[PDB]
Design a protein around this ligand. Structure first.
Ligand SMILES: O=C(O)[C@@H](CO)OP(=O)(O)O
Ligand SMILES: O=C(O)[C@@H](CO)OP(=O)(O)O
Ligand SMILES: [Mg+2]
Ligand SMILES: [Mg+2]
Ligand SMILES: [Mg+2]
Ligand SMILES: [Mg+2]
Lengths: 424, 423
């Protein structure tokens, strides 16, 4: 009976994210007693146009980072609005949530309250259908196991070091399947630990599980990764390529981009030249947020000059927002979008962004936040969307490895191809 | 009939340090699936049950667990299919007898434990009851006081710190959510304290900061400064616990405190702890002496056991036969409970009951190599042990356990162990 998908109760609680800050988790209980659960990640280098992450700002609790207000909105307004409604229709539930909040940026209820509900409803739906979550998320796209971009040297807002570029990533594009891709990245990660240790560089880790050494230059970081790849027995280019998340909005100040580690400051034109030179020296296949979120003329120049040679991922540029991505497509800016469910606040709006990207030749990279939880939703969503690329961290910290493990579980019975070099 | 096993299977997953470990799914004839994964230590005791690895240099630098996975998929599945998960003791008996070795070196303790815990979860799902409820064996349950390792050293971090774990315990909190809040607030203040002194705030394996230190006293001074700046009171609100992991420091008749350019014989190291305890509110010392230093442990227990909790970790490796001998010799007064040091839930329960029956406390513990599995949260509550050691306040390998304790606390209606752990 289809009344078995009707909501009995929605509740929320405050839990800790992987940096030790509060975040929200929601339980959707159906009339059958089935419970869908989901928790919400939290960024550090957040774009200025991300949907509202509602915090309490009570200095006596968690230094102002409590989320009891968002929890209360789930327990009260959201529960009352959704009780008796079916989780079978994700678009309708998400529509009701957005209409209930009735603000452009989800600043009344909180995007974290809304997203916790949205994702917990999706899980309640899958449980009701008695199907794996990734199957119930698919909207017709050919599913693949994604190529992971693995952030094994952390910098910027994610680490206590002098590194300006936020993320230095390896991508095991040459692996035959996903389990071997994970093995290759893990083996390189452990070799890199030894390479850093032999050079007296720090091997404690930053927020996403990458090592946090101080570096002489961005080229030194790429040299260290290259040395670990070689010592692990793999081939640059054929087996492993590089991806960067510069998070350049964090470096932009007073009309210039500041590479403090190299005592360099660049205008947009100079920074594009800098990337062109990096790409000619290293097999970098993707650069995320190479320019500031407001530098739309720079992004257009970057896309014209290098977009045929490299993937150009908008993160803070688009904030998983269909209306912004639409304008970017119209202006020919970037050629990929980083998909972060909590930048926009609902599964349905995330799907709108994915569809708009696919329909216009943009790739999607499914992404964690730097403040993660035990929730592995993005592993299922990455496979279901067929985006072929996932960004979910280094090879240590369970906030990252839990996603890789969930992909291993999916791979077991999915009988799906590995996206491999098709992502190029 | 709903508790009969249809199938058991395993898979290789990654632990929180990036090394392979094993996860098992137990499928009942009703289709209910219990799942559990197995943690892995770094500073392992010499007498821990066998963690079976593949030793294939082509895969994961020899650390794959496909051999253990195969033992679950084949030998263990065939031995258990048809049997009931309702009787945990019976299943664990059958697994140990199937292995037929003292140290579980045939099937692997990791294969056996993954099955043991997965069966426990399948049983709980079959009863439609919270896991912690189905694990209780009559003890009064409490929400445990967490000892929170916020400054990592020893085998868990790339720094000069010899002591493995510097922990705070929010013994003065009114309930568990506030206890977690206090530890978290102190953790973030400690980050600011370290940053202001130019000390490293990247983290070690258990999520504590990994700075270099001038001395163990400086580390305790830094924690004290963070406690004070966070607005809490030493002694009344927050006390300290240490895991020295002294077996890692012991060599050729001496304990080596390289960070302090000093070495100690057993007698001298006991004096060293006496002086630390007089200067700081240290209420617990874990593995203060080497796992084989049985005369030192006796002296330590006689001299300081009435002043401080003395936790055997590598000393006992969660092993009832070893703990029984330690009790008879009067060594230590608490035991660190690590399910994968012994390999079954039933043998773990034997160690807990032996400790309880002889007035020893139990501290439910993670390993430094963790997974997303939160079993020890439910087991800590169900056992009523009142103390849990499951990491700093960052890394989901640690926070997932704290979060599970928050979930249990919602409908459990249980007291917080609080200062009662000192009695
Ligand atoms: O910028 C990013 O892409 C993310 C993920 O690595 O970091 P943050 O969540 O801090 O925005
Ligand atoms: O010694 C310990 O108590 C544990 C947990 O901190 O560490 P390891 O798992 O490496 O043995
Ligand atoms: Mg960011
Ligand atoms: Mg980014
Ligand atoms: Mg140890
Ligand atoms: Mg120990």
């Amino acid at each position: 009976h289809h009344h078995h998908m009707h909501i009995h109760k929605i509740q929320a609680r405050e839990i800790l994210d992987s940096r030790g800050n509060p975040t929200i988790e929601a339980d959707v209980t159906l009339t059958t007693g089935i419970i869908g659960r989901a928790s919400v990640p939290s960024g550090a280098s957040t774009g200025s146009r991300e949907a509202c992450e509602l915090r309490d700002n009570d200095p006596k609790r968690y230094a102002g980072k409590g989320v009891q207000k968002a929890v209360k909105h789930v327990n009260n307004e959201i529960n009352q609005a959704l009780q008796g409604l079916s989780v079978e229709d994700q678009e309708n539930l998400d529509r009701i949530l957005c209409q209930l909040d009735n603000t452009e940026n989800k600043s009344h209820l909180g995007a974290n309250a809304i997203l916790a509900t949205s994702l917990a409803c999706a899980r309640a739906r899958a449980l009701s259908l008695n199907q794996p979550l990734y199957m119930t998320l698919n909207q017709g796209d050919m599913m693949t196991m994604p190529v992971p971009m693995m952030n094994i040297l952390n910098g910027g807002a994610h680490a206590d070091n002098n590194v300006d570029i936020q993320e230095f990533m390896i991508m095991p594009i040459g692996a035959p399947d996903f389990p071997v891709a994970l093995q290759m990245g893990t083996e390189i990660f452990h070799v890199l630990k030894s390479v850093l240790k032999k050079q007296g560089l720090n091997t404690a880790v930053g927020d996403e599980g990458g090592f946090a050494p101080n570096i002489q230059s961005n080229r030194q970081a790429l040299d260290l990764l290259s040395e670990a790849i070689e010592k692990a027995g793999f081939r640059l280019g054929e087996d492993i390529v590089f991806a960067l998340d510069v998070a350049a909005s964090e470096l932009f100040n007073e009309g210039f981009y500041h590479m403090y580690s190299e005592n360099q400051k660049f205008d947009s034109h100079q920074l594009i030249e800098y990337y062109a030179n990096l790409i000619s020296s290293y097999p970098i296949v993707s650069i995320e947020d190479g320019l500031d979120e407001k530098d739309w003329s720079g992004w257009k120049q970057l896309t014209t000059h290098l977009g045929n040679k490299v993937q150009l991922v908008g993160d803070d540029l688009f904030v998983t927002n269909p209306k912004i991505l639409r304008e970017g497509i119209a202006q020919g800016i970037a050629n990929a979008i980083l998909i972060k469910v909590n930048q926009i606040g609902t599964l349905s709006e995330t799907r709108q962004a994915i569809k708009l990207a696919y329909d216009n030749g943009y790739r999607c990279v499914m992404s964690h936040r730097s403040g993660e939880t035990e929730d592995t939703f993005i592993a299922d969503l990455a496979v279901a969307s067929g985006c072929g690329q996932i960004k979910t961290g280094s090879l240590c910290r369970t906030d990252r490895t839990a996603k890789y493990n969930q992909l291993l579980r999916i791979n077991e019975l999915a009988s799906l191809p590995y996206a491999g070099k098709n992502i190029l």
